[PDB]
């Protein structure tokens, strides 16, 4: 007997391709596999994962060729086995919701007294449609300081403070995931 699988993460770097990963299983009994089928809400045809390989073990990968028509997906994993066989709950996936980028770029920090912070969008993200609007966040804090100071910078690519330091940016495109922090810039 298996084994009840579960689809536990989906990422897309840019809305143009995306990948879902799942956790098995209980194989033994025999071995197992592991197919992921999906459909669009409202269609009763059931399609198989078009690309098992490029995602990594226990992945499914959706190429540019899917993105550009189908926006949303219902998905299921079928851990068939032997003296047993079994399915996962269905997963609704909307690409918009699982988009996470690359951290924002070349974070320059100037002294201008008072404090100037400019950066650029992440690479990986088009903004020329621009089927993303894109919220940014900053943190700073003296080198040996105890806490971080946060500022949500809403949506343009520059900001201003009033205070030996350390500075990072990150961004999210609602409705999806925050990027990792930009590598820290230092400033005397």
């Amino acid at each position, epitope marked *: 007997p298996p084994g009840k699988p579960e689809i536990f993460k989906c990422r897309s770097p840019n809305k143009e391709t995306f*990948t879902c990963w799942w956790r098995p299983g209980t194989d033994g009994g025999l071995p197992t596999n592991y197919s992921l089928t999906y459909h669009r809400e409202g269609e009763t045809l059931m399609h198989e994962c078009p690309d098992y390989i*490029t995602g*990594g073990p226990n992945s499914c*990968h959706f190429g540019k060729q899917y993105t550009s028509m189908w926006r949303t997906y219902i998905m299921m994993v079928n851990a068939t086995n032997q003296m047993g066989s079994s399915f996962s709950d269905e997963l609704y996936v909307d690409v918009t919701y699982i988009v996470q*980028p690359d951290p924002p770029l070349e974070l320059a920090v100037e002294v201008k007294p008072y404090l100037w912070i400019k950066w650029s969008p992440p*690479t990986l993200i088009d903004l020329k449609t621009g089927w993303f609007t894109l919220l940014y966040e900053i943190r700073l804090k003296p080198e040996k300081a105890a806490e971080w100071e946060i500022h949500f910078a809403g949506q343009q690519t520059e900001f201003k403070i009033l205070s030996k330091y350390l500075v990072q940016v990150r961004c999210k495109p609602d409705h999806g995931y925050w990027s990792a922090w930009s590598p820290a810039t230092f400033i005397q």
Partner: antibody
Amino acid sequence: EVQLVESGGGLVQPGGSLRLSCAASGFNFSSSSMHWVRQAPGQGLEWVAYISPYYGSTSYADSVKGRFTISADTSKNTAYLQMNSLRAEDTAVYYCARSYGYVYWNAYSSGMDYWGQGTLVTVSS
Amino acid sequence: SDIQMTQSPSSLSASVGDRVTITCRASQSVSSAVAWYQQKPGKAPKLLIYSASSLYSGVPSRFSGSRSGTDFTLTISSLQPEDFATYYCQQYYSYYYPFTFGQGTKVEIKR
């Protein structure tokens, strides 16, 4: 079935030039990124560069910045390593390999999971 | 490079059946972006473990990887003759210098 197929290895003058080649297949090239790693005989592995072929974005190991260029032909699924000003210390087996994802977006790779078998580059007169 | 990966010991030998432990210490936090590769000589390295502790497909389950803080350890639970190789760790956390390796660890079988 995945396959990365190296070539262009060979014997070159100190100061000379060489272009390695890695022809890939059976995974989505555009949504992957391609690596070169190298191993001078009897020592450990040294990562050299990768590229994200869709984006054209790249990074280079310091030991090689300024002299080697990585690039890709998306229409043919082939990554290249252009090696200039070769020194003797450049002598090694040169693997190509792939990760899921992109320059600056490695979080979700399951490491470098597919590897060529390497060609050998010898720099000597 | 900006993040260093120190790996010890640089070799060892053990009997068929012993539990065996390689340690890799990152020069700074690297969260969990750690891989482990086996390289049997005159062949290209083979992924064993990714994401600090996930076992790669088709790799035998006597191998396993774990993490505390910035130390990672590949551990072969009961050694086998065909496990003769050099193992390497690798971080892929760095923004500028991802995918750099440790200096590897040679493993020999005592018989």
